[PDB]
Structures are given as C-alpha cells and as structure tokens.
Amino acid sequence: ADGVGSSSGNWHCDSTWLGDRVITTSTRTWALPTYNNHLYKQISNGTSGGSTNDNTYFGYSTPWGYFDFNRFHCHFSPRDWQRLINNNWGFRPKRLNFKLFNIQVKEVTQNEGTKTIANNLTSTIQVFTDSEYQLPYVLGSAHQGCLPPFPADVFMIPQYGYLTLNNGSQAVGRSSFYCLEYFPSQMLRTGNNFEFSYQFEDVPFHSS
Amino acid sequence: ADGVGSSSGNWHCDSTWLGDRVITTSTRTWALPTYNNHLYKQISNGTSGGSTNDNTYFGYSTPWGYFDFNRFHCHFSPRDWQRLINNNWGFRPKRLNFKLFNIQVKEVTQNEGTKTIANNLTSTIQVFTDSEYQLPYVLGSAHQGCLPPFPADVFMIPQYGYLTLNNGSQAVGRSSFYCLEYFPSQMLRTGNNFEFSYQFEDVPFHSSYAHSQSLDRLMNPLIDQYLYYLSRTQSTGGTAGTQQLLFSQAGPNNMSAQAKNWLPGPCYRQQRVSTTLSQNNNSNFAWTGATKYHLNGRDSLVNPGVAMATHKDDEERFFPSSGVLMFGKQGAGKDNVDYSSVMLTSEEEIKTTNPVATEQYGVVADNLQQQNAAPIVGAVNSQGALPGMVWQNRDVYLQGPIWAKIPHTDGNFHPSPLMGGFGLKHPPPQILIKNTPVPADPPTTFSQAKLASFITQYSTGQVSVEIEWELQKENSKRWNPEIQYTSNYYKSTNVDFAVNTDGTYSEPRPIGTRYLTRNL
Amino acid sequence: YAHSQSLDRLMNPLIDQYLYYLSRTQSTGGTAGTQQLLFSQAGPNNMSAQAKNWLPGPCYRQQRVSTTLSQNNNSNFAWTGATKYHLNGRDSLVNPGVAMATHKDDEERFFPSSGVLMFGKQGAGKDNVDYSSVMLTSEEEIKTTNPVATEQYGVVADNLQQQNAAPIVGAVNSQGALPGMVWQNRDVYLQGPIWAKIPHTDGNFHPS
Amino acid sequence: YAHSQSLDRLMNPLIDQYLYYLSRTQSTGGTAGTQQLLFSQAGPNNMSAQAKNWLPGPCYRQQRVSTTLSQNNNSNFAWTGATKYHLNGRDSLVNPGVAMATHK
Amino acid sequence: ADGVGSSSGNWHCDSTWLGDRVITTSTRTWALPTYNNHLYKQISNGTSGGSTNDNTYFGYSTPWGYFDFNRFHCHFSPRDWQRLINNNWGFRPKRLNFKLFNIQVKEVTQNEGTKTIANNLTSTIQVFTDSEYQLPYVLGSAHQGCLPPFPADVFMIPQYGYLTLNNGSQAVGRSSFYCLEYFPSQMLRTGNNFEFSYQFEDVPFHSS
Numbered sequence A, E: 001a002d003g004v005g006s007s008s009g010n011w012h013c014d015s016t017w018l019g020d021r022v023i024t025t026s027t028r029t030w031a032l033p034t035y036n037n038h039l040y041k042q043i044s045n046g047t048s049g050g051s052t053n054d055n056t057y058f059g060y061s062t063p064w065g066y067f068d069f070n071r072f073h074c075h076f077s078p079r080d081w082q083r084l085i086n087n088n089w090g091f092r093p094k095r096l097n098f099k100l101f102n103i104q105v106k107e108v109t110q111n112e113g114t115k116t117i118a119n120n121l122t123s124t125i126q127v128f129t130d131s132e133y134q135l136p137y138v139l140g141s142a143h144q145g146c147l148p149p150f151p152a153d154v155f156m157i158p159q160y161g162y163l164t165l166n167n168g169s170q171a172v173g174r175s176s177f178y179c180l181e182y183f184p185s186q187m188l189r190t191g192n193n194f195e196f197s198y199q200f201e202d203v204p205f206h207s208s
Numbered sequence B: 001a002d003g004v005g006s007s008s009g010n011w012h013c014d015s016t017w018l019g020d021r022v023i024t025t026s027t028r029t030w031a032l033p034t035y036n037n038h039l040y041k042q043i044s045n046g047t048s049g050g051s052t053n054d055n056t057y058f059g060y061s062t063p064w065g066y067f068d069f070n071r072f073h074c075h076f077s078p079r080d081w082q083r084l085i086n087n088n089w090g091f092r093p094k095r096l097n098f099k100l101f102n103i104q105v106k107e108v109t110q111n112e113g114t115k116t117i118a119n120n121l122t123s124t125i126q127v128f129t130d131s132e133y134q135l136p137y138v139l140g141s142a143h144q145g146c147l148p149p150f151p152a153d154v155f156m157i158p159q160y161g162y163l164t165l166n167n168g169s170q171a172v173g174r175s176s177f178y179c180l181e182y183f184p185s186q187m188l189r190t191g192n193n194f195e196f197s198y199q200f201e202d203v204p205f206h207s208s209y210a211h212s213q214s215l216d217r218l219m220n221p222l223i224d225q226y227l228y229y230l231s232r233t234q235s236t237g238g239t240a241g242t243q244q245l246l247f248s249q250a251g252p253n254n255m256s257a258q259a260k261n262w263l264p265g266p267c268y269r270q271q272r273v274s275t276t277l278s279q280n281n282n283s284n285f286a287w288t289g290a291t292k293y294h295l296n297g298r299d300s301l302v303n304p305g306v307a308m309a310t311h312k313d314d315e316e317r318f319f320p321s322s323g324v325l326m327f328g329k330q331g332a333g334k335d336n337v338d339y340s341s342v343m344l345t346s347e348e349e350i351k352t353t354n355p356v357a358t359e360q361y362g363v364v365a366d367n368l369q370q371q372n373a374a375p376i377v378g379a380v381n382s383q384g385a386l387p388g389m390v391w392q393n394r395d396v397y398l399q400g401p402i403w404a405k406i407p408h409t410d411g412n413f414h415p416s417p418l419m420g421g422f423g424l425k426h427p428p429p430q431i432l433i434k435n436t437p438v439p440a441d442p443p444t445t446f447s448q449a450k451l452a453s454f455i456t457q458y459s460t461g462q463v464s465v466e467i468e469w470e471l472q473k474e475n476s477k478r479w480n481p482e483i484q485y486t487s488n489y490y491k492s493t494n495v496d497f498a499v500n501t502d503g504t505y506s507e508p509r510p511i512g513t514r515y516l517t518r519n520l
Numbered sequence C: 001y002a003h004s005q006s007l008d009r010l011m012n013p014l015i016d017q018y019l020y021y022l023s024r025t026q027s028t029g030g031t032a033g034t035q036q037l038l039f040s041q042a043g044p045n046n047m048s049a050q051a052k053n054w055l056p057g058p059c060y061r062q063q064r065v066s067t068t069l070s071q072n073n074n075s076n077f078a079w080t081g082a083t084k085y086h087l088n089g090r091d092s093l094v095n096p097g098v099a100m101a102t103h104k105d106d107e108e109r110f111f112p113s114s115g116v117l118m119f120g121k122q123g124a125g126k127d128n129v130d131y132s133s134v135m136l137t138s139e140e141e142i143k144t145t146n147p148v149a150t151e152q153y154g155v156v157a158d159n160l161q162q163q164n165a166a167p168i169v170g171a172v173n174s175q176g177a178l179p180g181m182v183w184q185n186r187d188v189y190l191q192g193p194i195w196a197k198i199p200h201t202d203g204n205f206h207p208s
Numbered sequence D: 001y002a003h004s005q006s007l008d009r010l011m012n013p014l015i016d017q018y019l020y021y022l023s024r025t026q027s028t029g030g031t032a033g034t035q036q037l038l039f040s041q042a043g044p045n046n047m048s049a050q051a052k053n054w055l056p057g058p059c060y061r062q063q064r065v066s067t068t069l070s071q072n073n074n075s076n077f078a079w080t081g082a083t084k085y086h087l088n089g090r091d092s093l094v095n096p097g098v099a100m101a102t103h104k
C-alpha cells in the first residue's frame, strides 16, 4: 500500500534497442510553484503602448502548469541519437507511457528575514490530461520549459496560458474562456502516483 | 486504506448531457473556521434600541457551519445554462450526491507578532445531515455563503443560527433550543471522507418558455361568437335617450367584449417606481408606500411577492418597488448602493397569463344601479384565487435559489416559492459541519468549571455536489426562429462571464430561463 | 402542535441575503431632496425587509371585542358591526370563520367577535348569559402561520405614483388564497365536533 | 342536479347548538347603556347566528341590469359600468364570469 | 486498520424510545491532565491544626483520573427527562456500553514566556476498569466531575484518591495502600480505542 514512508516508483532511464523498436525512457525531478496566487488573469497587449498592430494579443494566464517533453533531446542521449541517425533511414513514434511519482509537497513561510521549508503531508496536487483536446493545445509552439537534456538537472514546470481571438487588446464575442478546474482531475497526496498510456496514430516515417 | 499520505477523492467538474438527463457536478475548496469560540449564544434584538417592532428577533447562533449549494450558478457554467434554457422547455432535479474529502485540519498560534500554521494530524471534524428535518431549515432564505459560481474560488462556510418565537426581544414559552451536538454525527480525520445520497421527491417541471399567445387572445380572429353580450343600454341615434337593451355578438371588431373561459392569475399590487429619476415622486416612499403584510403585529415587506408581470408593453423603465428580484453586480456594497450596481430582473414573459404588478387587477361594481343612481365601478387592487384562473410561476435565474422547503402545515395553496424554485416538502438535507474542539492545557488541580481555553484551529478541504437533472425536450412546429440567449457580438473590454485583469470573476447580467415559446 | 418558528422568521439570523431591496428612494444627507434610487441587502439589522418564500394564510376580518368592558364602545354592535356573508338575500353571521389567530402578542383581552368557538360552563342558560358563564377558546398557536383575526391582512397600493402624486397604500381587510400561502386549520377541542360532512359539490377549496 | 338545501340551512331545525355567540354587547332594559358582554346559544329562533362549517363560493361582482326598462338607469353603462379585468394594459370584459347565481 | 489519519469512532447522542426500552447515549470531549507529577501521595488531615476530630482523614491521592457519569443529567436531555417522568411509573437500567475513541495526546513546553502545544503521536494512555471491585469505589459519593449536562461542553477528568482507616492523622495497621499500576490495563495510542460492556443486576424499578 501507499504511504508517506514508501516510494511511489523507481528511477528509469534507458534506451532499449531491440529489432526495429527502440524504447527510450527518461526520468527527471521537477518543481512546480504557485502561479498567479491561484488566480486566472486576463492578459492582453494593445497598440496603445509602443506595441504595433502585429504584436497585440488577448488571452488568459492560469495557475496551472504543464509538462512539455516535446523536444528530442529529452528522450535521447547524444549517443542514442547517434545510433539512430547513423544506422536508420526512418523512425516514427508508436506509443508513450507517462508517470508522476514520489511527490513531495512543501510549505514555505517567512519569519523576519529567515526562510524555512517543511513537509506538508496532507496537501495534494491536481493532475489531469486533456484526452479529448478540449483545451487550447499549447505544445508545438517551441516554447521553453522542456525536460532538461541532461538527466541530472531539476527543472521548473512552465505556467499554462492561452491566446484567443482579439480586436486590438479588446476581446471579441467569440473569445473563449476556459476554466481548467472544470475538468475532472486526479488529486494526489505524497503516496499517490499518476500514470496514463497513449498510442500514436499511424504517421509516415520521418525520412532520415 | 485511508491515511495521511493518500488522497480521499478526486476533483470533479462536468456537465454530462445524455438524452433527457443532464448530470452536473461541481467541486470546490472550502475553509471552515471556529465560530463563537465553540459556544452556543443567545442572540436577540429588541425595540429598546433604535430598532422598531418589525425588526425584533430572538434566536441562537451556534458554532456549527453549513453548506449551501442552493443557487443555480453553483451547478451550471454560463454555457451549461445556455444549453439548458435554449434547447429545453422544462427541467427538474432527480437526485444529488454529496462528498467531503481531502480534509486538512490546521492549528494556528500567535507568538509575539508572527503567525504560524501547522498541520494537526489527529484533529477531527463533525459532519452530520438532518435527514428527518428535525432542525430549523435555514436554506431557501437566499442567504449568502453559497459555493462560488466560479470553480477556482475558495469559499468560507457560513455560520449556522436560527430564529425562534419571540415577544419583543424576550423569549416565550414555546421557544425551542436545539443543541446540534445532540445529533449523531460522523467524525472525520484527514484520511476519512464523507458522502451521502439524496433523491428528490416528484415535483412539477419548472416551465422554461414564454407563451406565444396572450390569455385573452386565444380566440379565432376570423369567426364571430354565437354568444351575445350587452352592447348598448341606451337608445342610439334617437332624439330622446330613453333606455333600451340592445345585444350584439362579439367578433373580430370588438375582441375585448368576447366571452372567455379563463382569467388572469391572482394580483396583489405593488408600488410603481421609475428608473428615470425625474418621474418618481420626491419623498422617501420606499418603506412607507411599500406593499406590506401584517403578521402578528409586525409589518413585513412583501418581497418579491406573487409572480406578476414587471411592466406592460412599451414601458421599460417602470418596475414594481418590491416586486422584482434584485442582484448586485460584482463588488457591490451592502448599504444604500446606487442603482447602477444592482441588476434588476424583469418578467416580460408572464404578461400573457399574469397581471402587471403595478396596475389594478380589474374593475368591479360598487353599487346596485337605479333609474335614480348612476353605476359606480370600483378598482380591484388585490385579488385572491377564483375558479378558472391561470398563472405562471416566477422565473428561476442563474443566480437565484434552486429550491425552498414547503413549510409543514395543515394547508397551502399552490406551494411554490415566491422567489422561484422547486417547492419541496423534503428538500435536500442541510449539512452541518464543525471543528471538534481541542482543549488547551488544563490546570493540574481539578476544577469543575468548563474549559474555556482552546487551541485556535480551522479546517479546509474539498466538497463535491453532483445533481442529476431531468429535461423536458422542446418539440414544436413553430416555423420562424426562436429567441435565444446569445452573448454580445461586438467587441468588449473584457469577456463576459470571465475573469478580469485582476482575477475577479463577474456575472454581467441575470439570465432568465425562458426564451422558448409555447402556445398558451 | 404549535410551530416553534414564526413564518417570517424562517431566515438565518447570522447571514445577509444576496438579494437586494429598495431601501431609499430619496437622496440622503443632502441639502436637496432630489430623488435617487438606492438599494441594500437585507440582513439581521432589518429582517422585515428580507425576501421571503411564503405568505400568511388567508384573512377574512372580524370585529375586535375586549373582555375589559370600559374599552369596548357603548352601543350594540354585536349584530350590526358583525362580519356577515350574504347568501341569497339572507345575511348570515360568519361563525367561527376561517382559522385566524385570536389576538397578537401581549393582548389577552381582545377576541374576534364571531371568530372563536364559545363553550358554556355547566348549567349555562341559553339566552343572554353573562360573560362569566361562557368559556372562550383562543388560538395562540396559529399566530405564526396565520393572521390575527381582528387586524388587516396587509397593505397594498391604491395608485400609480407620479412626480405630481404621492403614493397611497390601501388596507387589505379580506384576502383570498394566493400562491405560496400557508395556514393552519382550527384546533379541535375536547368539547368540539370530531368531523363534518364535506358537501357534495363540483368544487371546494381545502375542504376542512 | 340542484341542491335541495341551501348552504346555510344545513342545520337541524329542532335542536339548539351547544356553541355560543355574542348576542348583545350592551346592557339591555337598563336606564344606562353601560356595555356588558352577553352570550347566547343559537337555535331555531335565530338561525342566521348559528356556527357553520362552510362558506359560499367565491364572488367577483357583476353589474345589475333589469329587463324592465324603466328601472334601469338612463345612460349607456354597458361598457363603462362593466366588470372588466385588466391584462397587459388591455381591459377585457369578464364574460360570462365566475359561476354565480343570476338573481335572488 | 487504525492509524493517525483515521478516526477511531463516531459522535453519538440520541434517545431511542422503543416500546418499554429507552436507550440513551451521550458523547463528550474530555481532557485528562497529569496529576501529582505522576506520584502517589499520602494525604492526611489531623486535629493538630484548626481541624476537629470529626474532619480528620488519612488516604492516598493517585495520578490516575476516572470517569463519572453517575448523574442523570448526563444521560438525559431535559426533554428526554420530561417524556420519562410524565408517561411512566418506573424505570431501571438494564445494560450500558462505554467507549473511548479519537485520542489526541499533546506535549506542552515552556520557552521563555511563550507556550506551545504539539502532537505527540507515540505517547499512550492507560485505561483499565475494575470489574472485580478490588478498589475503593469512589463513585456514589456525589462528587463533582461528571460529564457536563450539555453536550457541547468539554470537561476535565477528576483525580482519583481514596480514604482508609485512620486514628487521628496517623494510619493504623489495617490501612490499605493500593497501587493502581498493579492492575492489568490497556495502553492506547492515537489510533487505538477502548470499549467494554456492562449489564446491571436485577434491581427494583424506581417508583416514579
């Protein structure tokens, strides 16, 4: 059974080369802060300032963070990449598997000038996936915040926000507002772990 | 198994639209403080002070808090409300399911000027429901403290208190005192969770639609009636006015004279107030000219009153003084706030079957005529129920109450709440919650006096309420397009029903439920 | 049973209502009384102004008679000032009448003229017997849900206001049934009748 | 069918009621009219004063018109003196109206 | 299973009126201090002081506390007492059931002038019952310290002591000393709970 004194899962990094499959895996350590003091916030940029008409936007910045593994260097060591590109004409993803485990939650307080950090055992986190693609899909825009290339680094989970139709800085009628707490999500304490599986749709081999 | 390191339940917010059912669910995060330092307290207000005889009360304020989900905006997003009111004639609740989970309990202490908060793992909370309705039922009075409309907000559980029979500020013999610790309750630590199910008693669908016909126009415009009415009592066109009885069939020419099977709903008049300021009288008539009912020597303003049309055709600006529900815009003060802050609801759609709130129900005769005496017809300001009378209930709103508890009494007439809602004889049980008190260190030598020193403490956690709604699908042969509830097309500074720059959610306008039409 | 709560006090004494009412129609504290509409949430301070779901039972007024003799008028109003109903050219005294509270708080001595059941003490004459012989029943307990028999049901407006005309509110002496209205039936007594036969008719309203 | 009994006459003509009513509020036969409360049981003598379980049906009044012409007033009151109900700013004559006896 | 994060039992207060039985139940919250700094102490009062010969005693005061429910108001609300005495000639107890649950144990320390209190998860308490009546029976002397009449109060468990044969303040040869740690007892941490059942011996109805 789960508990505060037993680990949720194990560290895994490998590249398993078998036949025509290569299974690459990566594990990282992350730190997820509290964004916007738990607030949704309208964000916008108008032409009123030094901005031009091209740079205007309207959107919302949420408290939620998100994982981005979308860069290759996350899943391949430079040697694993070398085996790939030297020996092979093409490669395409088949399926992925994703895990959250070993969750520590820590409350930090300020007393005079000294900082102190202590475990909070009863606090939770909320993790959902959008399976039905009912959110603005923010990946694929080549934003920062991916898992580090090098497994020993700890990384910070980026904040989630999205952009919507605008006219200038003002919002039009078709502008959408998405409340992310309105999805079903799974709440995890320090003994809980999160996992799901995904299977890529058939896609033509990248031609290397 | 449960423990400090495993979550009790999961976050859920959805609207599941399947067939004639819609299952709406909501989860929030709450914080429950310690009220009255764990004391029951008599509270009362007498006429001795500046108070009048109408405002006096006697009652008790408990430590217990309670959950109130009774407003619609708790269970529906503004989009889920739009699917509802556009596509459907009626809806009624079927069953609900309610959950407490992920309970954190935290003790806070003061050292010099610095505050610190730390988990207390062994502390509990007490949660019971009154299933048998053995408590004053405090819901349905449209009090604050409901779950926020917007799921990201954390809310504070309101304190529970109740009022009892009084004479002045003093209590009479039939005054009841209820000790809430005297019920069985369930005590929960941080790994425990609480749940119960409830099933609504069969209740008539709230009718969301407008009539496409006024009540008096149900006639055929083409054909005359075979019935006769008394058109003229005096000889016409003659040099002498000697009376003669002359009769006529009513027809398309005079419809107001036709015989009709049905009468408008009952009328209890309101005072008329115009939004344009120069039209209203100069005085304060708000309380004095108000429509009141007198109960046990106390004049109680009638609010909102019986369901009655707000205004007649082509008068937008007039509204009944107490007649309409009034909602405040986000961040509106509690005292003497200007007109621009409140959102006045209006009933346009019941003009067909219901009388205008600010005008007389009709006219009746005050005397028996004679050749000597002229006929005199008096106005009817108040009209109770008469046979062959039809009316519409007040419209529910996205901000308004869902249900109310039909008082337990010998008799009632059309038991539906005047605020609008579903009158229920056994409403959802009200859920009471409290922090179990933890004593501060007692003395080392015994003393009978009860312990007045407690650890300052509060608890937080997650609450889920899931209601299954039954829908009445719209089936109509109407050719031309319906009116729908549509958001504004033109550009805006910020989106409606969404957070502003600073993070504050706001609801721009009240959304009534009836855009659809039916034949009367 | 009696209700432990009055009908208008069903509210929570602690919490304000999210509904607003019209508190003041005139500019307050200003040297000029120019009208302005001002709204307020009702709360523990003013309970009489809160929005309420339910209304008192129907009212058909009675004449008020005081047991203390010097308070009553000097005349015989028993038949003349009585509350009667006129059926087929015959005026029939309304006795006991609809169920209505006998008297309000801290008035013991007043009773409705025809409103209450009246039982005689053992060996009481049939004609013009003194007050001391009869036993007046009284309804204290329906004061919560029912109006007092000797007072008006309420007050309604008699006119449509204008800048020229002041608002005028008329009294409601008789009130039939309205939606959202609750009442208690008259109390049975040890000396009183057990049942009655509901006449056979097309329609009846709350046949008790 | 018609009822063979009026609503107020459902009583027994033979027997008195054990209930009392307020017959007289003033001292009778005395040189001074000082008020005194006096009670009586209703009986065959005064039936109009008896206690009754039931009340007549609801009433919404109509104007009275006589077929004999000289009795009616001289004017046209047909529309003006009519019993109307006001719905959405339109005055609609109440016809035939609630069920009520035509004449006594 | 028991643990620090799961409650031991539930709150119960009721009066169940069924036939000729009435089952009354009560739950309270208590606080048990540390008496005598964990010491047994001889206590005595002699005539040497202002005391007279009538007021002299010899006995021992223990660290142990004890529960006293022996007063009626513990088991009956004033309404439950009213149903009892109005409708019934006699009543006698049949059986009782007794429970300890939801035990918090807290260590308090002094630092300068500031007090602080914190959970001690590993500390225990010792609870036994004397079934064989091998102790001085201290109940029935109408001492204070019963459960409060009103369920919302928290009460303090009284200290346990007893008196023994004396001559003056001095002890005679038949004086007994009872060490309460010399009984078998059950030791409870914060997840443990204590319960036992008892069945009254047949006793004549109290005649009300």
Ligand SMILES: OC[C@H]1O[C@@H](O)[C@H](O)[C@@H](O)[C@H]1O
Pocket (backbone or CB within 6 Å): B052, B054, B055, B286, B287, B288, C046, C048, C049
């Ligand atoms: O002066 C105006 C006030 O009059 C009081 O009787 C009443 O409690 C208030 O609601 C307000 O009407």
Ligand SMILES: OC[C@H]1O[C@@H](O)[C@H](O)[C@@H](O)[C@H]1O
Pocket (backbone or CB within 6 Å): C078, C079, C080, D046, D048, D049
């Ligand atoms: O003079 C007083 C009397 O008046 C009569 O009309 C009536 O029958 C009596 O009950 C009494 O009221």
Ligand SMILES: OC[C@H]1O[C@@H](O)[C@H](O)[C@@H](O)[C@H]1O
Pocket (backbone or CB within 6 Å): B254, B256, B257, D078, D079, D080
């Ligand atoms: O002049 C008399 C006429 O008055 C009108 O208002 C009405 O339409 C007619 O039915 C008739 O009453």
